[PDB]
């Protein structure tokens, strides 16, 4: 049911965020010794980043930016404005600090219920700003006003931020 889908999604995103934090902790004592102008160390960063992406059912895209470097697995160059921003980190990389952004484009679960059940998903912050939408009626950056709409919905707070996941129908 919808209530089951939000619990499972919340728990899955929590596990996901949990793994990101584990990644950043582990490798802090591994980055300070890597140089991202060296093609052997860049390969080492991609391998670890892609390893993380695929320990997860959710579809995630990383952006590692800094001085004359842009590293990502968004090979088709999808617009990040339509994706959920999951986290952000500043990593010390010997030669400079590089910013790491993790984006969530979709989940196999949310993609499945949207296809089979027409149950859509929203993520909103405490001021009703829309941070994620797979329904074309809503667009990220705008406001979600629940009163304008009549839907079945169940919502839940996510552990990693003051955000609410909303799964709804109609």
């Amino acid at each position: 049911t919808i209530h089951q889908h939000v619990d499972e999604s919340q728990s899955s995103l929590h596990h996901t965020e949990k793994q990101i934090q584990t990644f950043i902790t582990q490798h802090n004592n591994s980055f300070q010794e890597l140089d991202l102008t060296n093609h052997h160390d860049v390969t080492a960063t991609k391998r670890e980043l892609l390893k993380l992406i695929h320990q997860q059912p959710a579809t995630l895209y990383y952006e590692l930016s800094g001085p004359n470097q842009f590293i990502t697995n968004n090979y088709e160059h999808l617009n990040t404005k339509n994706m959920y921003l999951f986290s952000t980190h500043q990593l010390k990389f010997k030669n400079s600090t590089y910013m790491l952004k993790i984006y969530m484009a979709n989940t196999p679960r949310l993609s499945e219920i949207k296809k089979d059940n027409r149950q859509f998903a929203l993520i909103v912050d405490q001021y009703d700003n829309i941070l994620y939408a797979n329904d074309d009626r809503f667009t990220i950056g705008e406001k979600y006003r629940p009163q304008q709409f009549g839907f079945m919905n169940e919502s839940v707070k996510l552990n990693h931020a003051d955000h609410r996941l909303i799964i709804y129908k109609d």
Binding site: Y127, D128, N129, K143
Partner: protein
């Protein structure tokens, strides 16, 4: 709880900066949109206990017919505002400078010349000009004044109104001129830039005969239980850092001395616009003028 704001501004201008205030002060801000005078009329009939907290946008210093619906106030920052546009009304704090413009479709224009209001009267442009209801909108009313201030003849206003199609909403003028339904229209800078930046064939004309400059205001609404953050909002909107932003991010024209303008791309700087001076600016109050020309 929720801090409600009446505004005729388009969301794309005020929504981003109010958002920055929401998560700076931990407040929810709701915006009630609509034409200036429609909001003021709906507000007037609204119960004291159901009224919002703040009104921003519109030429408030000159078109509030019901002062009793507002609380006297002026931010401490008026000292840093441009001397000529400081509000001399105790309910309104000045907030932005907004040129009223003529917007021209450059795909349709051809060789027709549109340099001001007189050119809009070329018989070839009859039925192909759009404007917004001067009774309900700040934009239509301010344009009618400027038309009147050309030669101070009410016949010029009527000749235009017979020559052009009146619309209900200011934002409908630029949209329909931008999409090629009208050759030109009367609008405002900030809504014309908006459509021009999306790629539409929109030319911004500052009328030579004289350009009306709108001094947008902010006023506290008189209600039963005013929101405790609403005075912080007024101080926030008149702060330097927010004005600098409005300048930097939206090409708005700031009310403050200490905020310089920004550079070109079809938005002239103030000193290069042909403004109606204090001299030729008609004197008549709001309701008198609407009745005079109807």
């Amino acid at each position: 709880n929720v801090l409600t704001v009446y505004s005729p501004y388009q969301s794309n201008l005020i929504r981003p900066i109010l958002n920055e205030f929401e998560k700076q002060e931990h407040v929810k801000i709701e915006i009630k949109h609509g034409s200036t005078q429609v909001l003021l009329s709906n507000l007037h009939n609204e119960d004291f206990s159901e009224r919002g907290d703040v009104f921003m946008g519109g030429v408030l210093s000159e078109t509030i017919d019901h002062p009793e619906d507002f609380v006297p106030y002026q931010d401490t920052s008026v000292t840093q505002q441009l001397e000529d546009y400081r509000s001399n009304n105790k309910y309104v704090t000045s907030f932005l400078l907004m040129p009223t413009v003529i917007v021209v479709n450059s795909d349709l224009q051809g060789d027709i010349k549109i340099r001001g209001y007189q050119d809009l009267l070329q018989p070839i442009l009859k039925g192909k000009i759009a404007y917004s209801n001067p009774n309900t909108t700040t934009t239509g009313y301010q344009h009618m004044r400027a038309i009147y201030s050309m030669h101070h003849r009410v016949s010029d206003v009527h000749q235009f109104q017979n020559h052009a199609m009146q619309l209900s909403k200011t934002s409908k003028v630029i949209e329909d001129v931008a999409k090629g339904k009208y050759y030109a229209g009367l609008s405002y800078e900030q809504d014309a830039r908006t459509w021009k930046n999306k790629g539409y064939p929109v030319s911004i004309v500052y009328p030579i005969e004289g350009t009306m400059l709108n001094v947008d205001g902010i006023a506290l609404v008189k209600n039963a239980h005013p929101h405790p953050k609403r005075k912080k909002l007024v101080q926030y909107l008149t702060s330097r850092s927010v004005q600098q932003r409005l300048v930097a991010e939206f090409d708005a024209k700031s009310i403050r001395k200490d905020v310089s303008e920004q550079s070109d791309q079809s938005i002239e700087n103030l000193k290069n616009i042909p403004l109606i001076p204090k001299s030729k600016l008609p004197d008549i109050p709001h309701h008198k003028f609407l009745e005079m020309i109807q």
